[PDB]
Amino acid sequence: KQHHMERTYELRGWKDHIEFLEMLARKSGRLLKGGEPDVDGVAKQVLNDFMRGKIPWFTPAPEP
């Protein structure tokens, strides 16, 4: 859910995943040489949080 991601990263207003990773990189300082955001490293951080449960998510049970 979007509000969980916004509460987790204190970050909001993105239009897509690319802009989300870019603003997360600019906020967290994940920058390459020349002020270029590290979208690969930020995506790896997000995936690590997703599988380690820092980001809350679940699969809803089937309705009877």
Partner 1 sequence: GVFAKRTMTKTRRRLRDLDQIERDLRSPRHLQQYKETKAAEDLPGLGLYYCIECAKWFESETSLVGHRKGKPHKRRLKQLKEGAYTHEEAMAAIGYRIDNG
Residue ranges in 3-62 that form contacts with RNA under rule CB under 7 A: 10, 27-35, 38, 40-41, 44-45, 48
Closer residue to partner 1 in complex, CB, 38/45: 38
Q: Give 22 or 45: the residue with its C-beta nearer to partner 1.
A: 22
Phi and psi for 35 in degrees, rounded to 5? 70, 20
b/e burial code for range 38-54 (CB count within 10 A of at least 16 → b): bbeebbebbeeeeeeee
- Please provide the size of the chain in residues: 64
Q: Note the residues at the interface with RNA (CB under 7 A).
A: 10, 27-35, 38, 40-41, 44-45, 48
